[PDB]
């Protein structure tokens, strides 16, 4: 058959120059790869900086706890109440280790639950981690690493100067219970000899630590509880300050934004999974060609226009927002390639200014509706962002219900809310819009509209119809023009937003059973034959493949399956037929749909119900 279907081995090495940046140069020098690398590195550095600014307070508390233990038997321990998303947490501990290597306050060993199956392996991993941590800051065997060697090493090194011995346990729930209890007893027995600090990584609650630590074990424990900020709070902070930040030209659409937030809030609280899904979305957007490399600031996009080729204009011609720009004006647009080359920077500055005014109008309207009760549009910026990019926001009945509830209030609360909206929008314009390039025209366009709103507030505070005038003016100069949908968007807005959701939905969320169910119900969806078509999903025509017929034939039967009537009904549908049926029951057992029971002479049981 094949070279790799050997009956003896299972693994095959194709070493070509291995000893003790995957793509070529022709793809890297393309401008979309450089633009995607710059944008992804910017977004990843911003998310890392936000996570550092979130974690730094609890990091300082833990460092002060270790130092205050050093300035000082039971051992001092510190349960760190992290979230359920474990792969987000260990990097946090690494940051703590770096700070504990800054002040020379301790040296840190990390005990994973995979290394601590027994007490011997846990003690050996602990001593080896501490000794190699000292060796790496400034080799013993596996069976040589003992607590007596740790005591001798600590006497030889750090008795003359004290360094704490911080023991970090990142996955407290996944430990063997008896190994963890005996490790706490071992560490508490050596108090006074070796200064031990025990940092825990409890993910669920303090009830877990109180349950898995018995009476005699918790008699030697002086724990102090720390709290980390929650994963929905970190998600909302990342969404407020990065994904809605105006200084990135790459926008998401409403459906992809809702898809990624649904993946976070409904399935798994993993910030890293959100980051990798957003990275895949940014990669799938920018990997459409050099035409999508114009999605940056103004000067770099103008340069990329000046270096652009012919096929990039040919693929910005095909995008659906380009054609109503043509129909609204013709003989030079569609083929001549230079009329569009001189017409593009106006469209680029139009889309950039439209998205900047969209963010500012979104800030204004979320301050206006955010303190309102009953929240018909949502509380934060993100739900209003989805509802304002999805559809016509004024044609939606939720905005009319919002207007009915804003009319049901007094004049004092309305005046206070619109003054708060004016002050917040001016603060957002002076802080975050002002350093941004092509931001001067943004303020110079949106600010006289705000002067109109503020003068309407001035006439309603000087004198019920002026409240309605303020509401309709807020509608007319903020909600109508600067808060469009994605269908009422400007021309050629595809380069900047990303609406391709079915391909990303297939390639991020994995549905093996849907594809198996479709390929076993109608193979015509995959084979695309002119003969295997089915009107309904149970016709069972004769030109079907073999495994589809056997799956349909066992699907209608009961729990227990006989070989005889199933083989006879297969002969009724479709020698070598026995070899084909043996091949079919082997392939259908291989997928996990049925199972041949052990010494049930021919009867096989279906595991799917």
């Amino acid at each position: 058959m094949d070279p790799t279907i050997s009956v003896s081995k299972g693994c095959f090495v194709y070493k070509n120059g291995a000893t003790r940046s995957l793509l070529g140069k022709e793809v890297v020098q393309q401008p979309f790869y450089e633009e995607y690398r710059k944008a992804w590195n910017q977004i990843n550095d911003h998310i890392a900086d936000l996570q550092h600014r979130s974690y730094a307070r609890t990091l300082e508390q833990l460092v002060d706890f270790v130092v205050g233990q050093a300035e000082r038997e039971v051992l001092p321990t510190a349960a760190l109440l992290t979230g359920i998303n474990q792969p987000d947490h260990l990097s946090q501990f690494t940051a703590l280790t770096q700070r504990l290597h800054a002040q020379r306050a301790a040296m840190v060993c990390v005990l994973q639950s995979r290394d601590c199956a027994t007490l011997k392996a846990a003690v050996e991993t602990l001593v080896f981690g501490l000794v190699e941590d000292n060796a790496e800051v400034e080799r013993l065997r596996r069976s040589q690493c003992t607590m007596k060697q740790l005591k001798s090493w600590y006497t030889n090194n750090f008795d003359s100067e004290r360094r704490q011995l911080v023991v970090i346990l990142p996955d407290f729930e996944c430990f063997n219970a008896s190994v963890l209890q005996d490790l706490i007893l071992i560490l508490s027995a050596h108090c006074g000899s070796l200064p031990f600090v025990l940092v825990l990584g409890v993910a669920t609650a303090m009830t877990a630590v109180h349950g898995t630590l018995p009476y005699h074990v918790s008699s030697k424990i002086r724990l102090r509880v720390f709290q980390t900020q929650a994963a929905p709070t970190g998600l909302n902070e990342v969404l407020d300050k990065v994904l809605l930040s105006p200084k990135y030209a790459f926008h998401l659409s409403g459906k992809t934004f809702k898809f990624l937030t649904h993946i976070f809030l409904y399935y798994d609280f993993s910030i890293h999974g959100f980051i990798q899904g957003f990275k895949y979305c940014l990669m799938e957007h920018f990997f459409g060609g050099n035409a999508f490399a114009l999605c940056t600031d103004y000067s770099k996009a103008l340069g990329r226009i000046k270096q652009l080729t012919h096929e990039d204009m040919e693929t910005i011609r095909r995008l659906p927002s380009f054609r109503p720009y043509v129909e609204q004006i013709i003989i030079a647009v569609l083929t001549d390639d230079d009329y569009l080359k001189k017409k593009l920077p106006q469209l680029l500055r139009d889309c950039l200014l439209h998205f900047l005014l969209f963010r500012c109008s979104l800030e204004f309207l979320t301050e206006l509706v955010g303190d309102l009760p009953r929240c018909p549009l949502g509380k934060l910026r993100r739900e209003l962002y989805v509802n304002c990019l999805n559809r016509a926001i004024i044609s939606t009945p939720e905005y009319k219900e919002c207007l009915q509830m804003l009319s049901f209030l007094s004049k004092d609360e309305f005046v206070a809310k619109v003054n708060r909206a004016l002050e917040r929008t001016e603060q957002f314009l002076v802080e975050e819009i002002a350093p941004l390039e092509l931001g001067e025209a943004c303020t110079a366009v949106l600010r006289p509209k705000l002067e109109a709103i503020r003068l309407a507030v001035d006439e309603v505070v000087k004198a019920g119809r002026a409240l309605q005038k303020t509401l309709q003016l807020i509608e007319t100069q903020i909600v109508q023009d600067h808060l469009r949908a994605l269908q009422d968007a400007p021309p050629i807005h595809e380069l900047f937003v990303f609406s391709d959701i079915a391909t990303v939905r297939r390639n991020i969320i994995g549905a093996p059973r849907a594809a198996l169910h479709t390929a076993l119900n109608n193979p015509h969806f995959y084979m695309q034959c002119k003969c295997c078509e089915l009107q309904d999903q149970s016709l069972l025509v004769g030109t079907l493949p073999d495994l589809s017929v056997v799956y349909k034939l066992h699907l209608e039967c009961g729990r227990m399956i006989n070989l005889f009537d199933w083989l006879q009904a297969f002969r009724s549908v479709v020698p070598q037929i026995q070899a084909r049926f043996t091949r079919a029951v082997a392939e259908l057992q291989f997928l996990g749909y049925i199972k041949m029971s052990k010494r049930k002479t021919d009867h096989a049981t279906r595991l799917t119900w």
Binding site: R317, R318, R323, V326, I330, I331, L334, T335
Partner: peptide
């Protein structure tokens, strides 16, 4: 519709102006 037939019809009607 196809971009080819739409571009062809728009160019032909642009010659029909």
């Amino acid at each position: 519709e196809d971009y080819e037939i739409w571009k062809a019809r728009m160019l032909a009607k642009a010659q029909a102006k």
